[PDB]
Amino acid sequence: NIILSKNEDSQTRTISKNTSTSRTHTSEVHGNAEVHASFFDIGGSVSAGFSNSNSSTVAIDHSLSLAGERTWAETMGLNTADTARLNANIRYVNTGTAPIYNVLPTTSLVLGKNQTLATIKAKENQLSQILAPNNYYPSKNLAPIALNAQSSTPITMNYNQFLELEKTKQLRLDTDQVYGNIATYNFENGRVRVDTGSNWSEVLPQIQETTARIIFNGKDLNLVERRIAAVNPSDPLETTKPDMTLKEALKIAFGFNEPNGNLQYQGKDITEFDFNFDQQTSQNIKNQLAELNATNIYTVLDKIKLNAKMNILIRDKRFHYDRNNIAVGADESVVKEAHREVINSSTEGLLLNIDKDIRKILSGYIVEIEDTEGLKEVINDRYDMLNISSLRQDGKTFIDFKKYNDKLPLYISNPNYKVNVYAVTKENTIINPSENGDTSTNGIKKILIFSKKGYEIG
C-alpha cells in the first residue's frame, strides 16, 4: 500500500490506497511501434521479447477511501505550484530456487516510461535475515518495510507528475540482480557457511547462458520462473550435459506428472496452456516439428530438444493476458461458472465460494435491481463503487450491498424484482471518469453473475 500526501492541521488532506503487485514479463508489441533503426541489429535492441531482469508492477486501488471524494487534487489540495510526497510499505520476496543471506537488491521505483521517482536500496549487511524461496522478506508475520520513512530526502512529485499517477494509478518496480554472497556446504564438519569468495554476480550469468528458461503459472497466476539444464551444441563441455526434452523438463521444473498417461499439472492437462516462444526458440523448435512431421506440439512434446538460451512461456489458456503477461480476465463462460455456487443470499450481502484462480481476474461487482418490466436501476453506480467483494479466511468470498447504500440493507418495495449483481474483470474495469464527468457504470462490460427474485432471498 502507498500513501500520497501534500509535501509539508493536515490529517484528511492525505490519500491512502492499497495496491496489488505481481511479477511481470513484458513481451513485444503488436507490430507498428516505431522502433529505432538499431532494432534489427546484432544484440542491439533485440531483446528477443523478454530477457533476464526482475520487474514487478503495482496498481493503485482505484476504489474509494472516503465519501463523495473526487479527483485526488481537491481531496488533498494540490495546486500547480505544489509538491506531493510519496511513501509506501513494500516487501522483498524471493521467487526463485535459492536464498539470499545478506545484501538485498537495489530496486528502483519508476513512474511511466522513464520517470524514476526514487531508488530503494536498504543498507547492506544491515540485515542478517534470510530471503528464502517462496517467502516474503519481511516475514509476512512482521512489519512490512516502508519507503523513505525511517532518510533526509523523501520522494518528490510535482503537480504534473502527481497528475499522471492518478491518470493510470500504477507504478513500476525494477530490481537489479546484485544479491549477497552465497551459502555453501563444508564436508569437514557438515556446516552451512557463507563464502565471501562466491557471489551470485559471478556464478549466475552462466545459468542464463547454459540453460532453458520456462515461465509457467500453475501454482497460481503469478509468472514463475525456472531454468533447466539444457545443452548447447557449439559448446563441447555443455554437451557433456544430459539431453533435455520439453516434457521431462515440465516434470522436474514445475512438477507436471503422468497420472493415467496424460502429462497434466495437479489436474490441468498440458493442453490447457499456451506455448509461446521467442524469435529464436521459435525456429529451434519449428525445425524439430519439421523433421518430426507433425503440427501439434502437444504430441511430439516428449521429443523436443531444449537447447541453452531457449525461452518458453507456459501460461494457462483459460484467462486473457495483457502486455506484462498477467492474469487479466477470462471469458464470460469460465467467469459465470466460478460463481454458479451459492452459500447464503441476504438483503445484506451474498456469500459465495468463488474460485481463487478466477476471483483474481475480477475488479468488482455492480449491484443493481431490474424492475418486473425492464428497468436498470443500479446501486453503486460509480466506477469507484465496485469495491465490495470481501473474503473470509474460510475461503468464501463475501459480497456486501450495504457498503454502498447508507450502510443499510437492500430495499425491496416489491419482492418480485431481480437483484442483478454483475462482475467486472480487470481487463474491462475503468479507473477514471470519461472525457466529461461520467462517474457512472454506463460504459462498462460487466458479466451476469447473480439474478434471484425478491422472494428467493429473504
Binding site: 465519501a67 463523495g68 453503486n380 460509480r382 447504500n405 447508507d406 437492500l410 430495499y411
Partner: protein, 181 residues
Amino acid sequence: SCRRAFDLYFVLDKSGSVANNWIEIYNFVQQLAERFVSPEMRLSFIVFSSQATIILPLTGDRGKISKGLEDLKRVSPVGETYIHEGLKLANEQIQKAGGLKTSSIIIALTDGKLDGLVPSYAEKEAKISRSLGASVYCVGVLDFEQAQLERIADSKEQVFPVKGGFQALKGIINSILAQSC
C-alpha cells in the same frame, strides 16, 4: 422588490436511508406542484443517491410535469447519499437560464444524514446555489440532521420538516409568495 416568475427545483434524496418515507417526499412534491400552477412557475425534478438525475427539466408544462410526478411516484429509494451532486444538477439548470437573471427556489428533500466529504461538498455546492441568485430549501425527512440542513440552505428558516400541520407547505408557499406582487 416583488416578482411573478419562480422556478422551483425539486432535488430528491432517493437513498436507501429514506426508502421508507419516500411517499411523504412525493406528496410534498405533489402537494407543492399542485399549489403553484402559474405558467411562470416552471418546475424541475431531480433525484440523487449514488448519483442524481434530471427527472423533470425546468419548464411550466403540466403535460410533462404530471409525467414527472408519475415517475417520482414509481421510484425505489436506494443508493448512497450524494446530495451535493443533486444540488449541482440544480445550479447547472439555473446558470443555463441566466444565473442571477433567474429567481430560483431549490427545494432539496433528504434525511440530512450525510457522510464523509458529502457534508463539505454539500455545504459548498449549496453556497454555489445562493451564489446564483437562488434560495435553498432543506425539507428533511425522519429525524433528519437539522444542523446539516441549516448549513445547506439559507438559514434555519428554510428548513421545514415535511411532518407537521402543513408547516412546510404553509411556511414555504407563504415564504415564496412573500416575494410575489
